[PDB]
């Protein structure tokens, strides 16, 4: 259509002459300053912005967007032809390929794509609004598109051959093979004139040292679930990523990818069979992912412990005891997890705590124990049967690895998952067979469990294992067992209904006449308070002993010697150290031990 010879000179003029002001109105050539770095090998990736190109040629922007890959190659050629103009220093060779190219140049004094160590990408123009995956239709083939989606699978970084370098055994000459296709034919026999005319029979040996490789990474993007149409399955697209765009995104990341939408090339028998139809991939060009003084003066208030506990659940009344316990769940004990179990009737604000703590926790998950049809508590295998490669998905316990996992209806957990919870609570890992071969996954996470009675409402006449129908081997792993009771209570019910009705009619929390700390401030505080690693003084050992034995003997004297053990003392110490972390003091003290004892006693009081 256009004359690409003239277009290359236009691109050169843009790259040489464009300027932008960054500071105090001073003029800088943002692309010349980067061509200097590219020439000096200080920078490898050059992201040219078509919003910048639009400031002096919208027609060039339209041409690039409508035939992007051609213009990507043209921009790369123009940049390579421009770098000698900007050379002013010698390169420090740090890649072995730099050393090889240095000796290649010296021997030539005594392969453009090979000498090309840089990579150029189009940063998309803002006029191109971002599409969903479902909107990337056949009309956009070969055109620059911006696509939003969920990253759901990412491969390891692999070496993609760009220019294969061979050496001949007979004539001692190097041979070069640029590689555009996803597959290529290796060279066997030397094509040099010296070997051919003499019929020398000299063959070629690939030199990975001399060849050019580029980082390569496949991924899968998936539609946003709320953006999928009503009756439909979410669509997915393969994104092929190269060079500096690799390792930007991980699974679960919300991303926007500017790239070129292309059909997949086929070889052998696939082109025979598929006919005119073709699969597609997106060639990634840019991937984008979607206190100390001032609040210390607030933290100086003696309210701060109860202020945090109030901020842990402002929609619930009377349960400040439980909110303090859940604060220690988020803080954790000294190295260390703190596990909590909540029991109550169905349809109570016991799932509210799971939701709130999951929302507040930096790393977290919130599943249910009732046998999920997806990835369960433990990992699972996906076949990806467009190609057949098995791949491993984490699940709740693994995805909440260095944080907290909330499990609703913890009682309905099957034995296959209860054993996994035993594995997590005993040694903080899970194990799974991928293809008969077993791999091990980290799960170093605190469990917030919520159970319901097996049948009917809770009944204090019966024992706890009779109520919940879950064995003591599970129940004893937890540090606090709470009964989240619910009785009809006229004024509290009226206030709850007023609160929920305000939430419905205004889509916002009502004014409670209290100012809780904001969620980001709470997160920064917990990080600041868990950065500490307190130690218990040895003089307090006698007091810890006295508290433990008197609690034990009260259980003997007044409640028929209900179960306790040495892990009770260990749980008290972990709770007191969590309180020390919360108070940001590196020594545990009498008040910490007293509050840990009080917390355990009131949890048992809620049970009784």
């Amino acid at each position: 259509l256009k004359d690409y010879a003239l277009e290359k000179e236009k691109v050169k003029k843009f790259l040489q002459e464009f300027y932008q002001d960054d500071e105090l109105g001073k003029k800088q050539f943002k692309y010349g300053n980067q061509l200097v770095r590219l020439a000096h090998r200080e920078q490898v990736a050059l992201y040219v912005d078509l919003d910048d190109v639009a400031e002096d040629d919208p027609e060039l922007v339209d041409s690039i967007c409508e035939n992007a890959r051609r213009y990507a190659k043209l921009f790369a050629d123009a940049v390579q032809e421009l770098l000698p103009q900007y050379k002013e220093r010698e390169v420090v060779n740090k890649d072995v390929l730099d050393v090889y190219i240095e000796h290649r140049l010296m021997m030539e004094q005594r392969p453009a794509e090979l000498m090309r160590r840089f990579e150029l990408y189009f940063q998309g123009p803002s006029s191109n609004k971002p599409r969903v995956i479902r909107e990337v239709r056949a009309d956009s083939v070969g055109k620059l598109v911006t696509v939003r989606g969920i990253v759901t699978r990412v491969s390891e970084v692999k070496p993609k051959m760009v220019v294969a370098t061979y050496t001949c055994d007979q004539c001692g000459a190097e041979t070069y093979q640029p590689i555009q296709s996803p597959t290529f034919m290796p060279l066997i026999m030397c094509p040099s004139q010296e070997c051919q005319t003499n019929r020398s029979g000299g063959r070629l040996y690939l030199q990975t040292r001399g060849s050019r490789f580029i980082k390569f990474q496949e991924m899968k993007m998936q539609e946003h679930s709320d953006q999928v149409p009503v009756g439909n399955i979410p669509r997915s697209i393969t994104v092929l990523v190269e060079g500096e765009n690799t390792r930007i995104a991980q699974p679960g990341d919300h991303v926007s990818v500017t790239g070129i939408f292309l059909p997949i090339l086929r070889t052998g028998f696939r082109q025979v069979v598929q006919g005119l139809l073709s699969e597609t991939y997106l060639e990634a060009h840019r991937i984008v992912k979607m206190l100390t003084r001032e609040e210390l003066r607030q933290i100086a208030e003696e309210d701060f412990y109860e202020k945090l506990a109030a901020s842990i659940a402002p929609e619930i009344y009377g349960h400040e005891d439980v909110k303090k316990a859940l604060l220690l769940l988020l803080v954790g004990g000294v190295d260390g997890n703190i596990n909590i179990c909540l029991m109550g009737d169905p349809g109570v604000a016991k799932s509210q705590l799971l939701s709130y703590i999951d929302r507040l926790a930096p790393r977290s998950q919130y599943t249910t124990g009732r046998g999920s049809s997806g990835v369960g508590l433990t990992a699972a295998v996906l076949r990806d049967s467009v190609s057949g490669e098995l791949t491993l998905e984490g699940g709740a316990l693994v995805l909440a690895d260095q944080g907290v996992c909330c499990i609703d209806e913890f009682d309905k957990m099957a034995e296959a998952d209860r054993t996994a919870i035993h594995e997590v609570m005993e040694q903080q890992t899970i194990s799974i067979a991928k293809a008969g071969i077993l791999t091990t996954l980290n799960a170093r996470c605190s469990i917030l469990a919520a159970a319901n009675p097996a049948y009917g409402r809770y009944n204090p006449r019966r024992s706890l294992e009779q109520n919940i129908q879950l064995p003591a081997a599970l129940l004893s792993r937890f540090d606090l067992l709470w009964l989240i009771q619910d009785r009809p209570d006229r004024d509290n019910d009226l206030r709850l209904a007023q609160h929920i009705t305000y939430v419905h009619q205004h889509s916002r929390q009502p004014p409670s006449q209290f100012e809780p700390l904001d969620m980001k401030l709470m997160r920064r505080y917990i990080a600041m308070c868990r950065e500490k690693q307190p130690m218990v003084p040895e003089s307090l050992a006698d007091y810890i002993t006295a508290a433990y034995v008197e609690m034990r003997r009260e259980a003997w004297a007044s409640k028929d010697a209900t179960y306790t053990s040495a892990r009770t003392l260990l749980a008290i110490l972990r709770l007191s150290t969590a309180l020390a972390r919360l108070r940001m003091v590196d020594v545990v003290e009498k008040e910490d031990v007293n509050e840990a004892i009080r917390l355990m006693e009131m949890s048992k009081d809620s049970l009784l």
Binding site: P159, Q207, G210, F213
Partner: protein, 130 residues
């Protein structure tokens, strides 16, 4: 003729590398003549390999360590030639089933599996794993 050899596209002389490793074997003594004790242990035990610490190679000669890491496919056979030459210059009538293999190693990992790149191809690495 060995003195004419250089590693391909490398400018490192194989004979000079061999001599540097030989004087390393002859003169490194301080892990607290070190490796001649290992040669004697090979001589009496009959196991054809020599373990060598890359940190010892580095502290003795930084350039030799750089050559070993960058070009192991040529440098490690050069070290095999060096160690076998020393071993059979000594112990002249000891019989071995095979020539000795030099087995350089780093005491700890230099890289991890996630950070392995195409820049590391045909390069000596140490990684930890299960």
């Amino acid at each position: 003729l060995g003195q004419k050899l250089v590693i391909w596209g490398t400018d490192v002389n194989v004979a000079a590398c061999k001599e540097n490793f030989q004087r390393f074997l002859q003169r490194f003594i301080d892990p607290l003549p070190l490796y001649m004790q290992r040669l004697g242990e090979i001589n009496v035990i009959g196991e054809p390999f020599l373990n060598v610490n890359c940190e010892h190679i580095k502290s003795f000669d930084k350039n030799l360590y750089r050559q070993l890491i960058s070009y192991p496919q040529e440098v490690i056979p050069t070290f095999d030639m060096a160690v076998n030459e020393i071993f059979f210059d000594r112990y002249p009538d000891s019989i071995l089933e095979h020539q000795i293999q030099v087995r350089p190693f780093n005491a700890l990992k230099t890289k991890n599996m996630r950070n392995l790149n195409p820049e590391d191809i045909d390069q000596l690495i140490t990684i930890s794993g299960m």
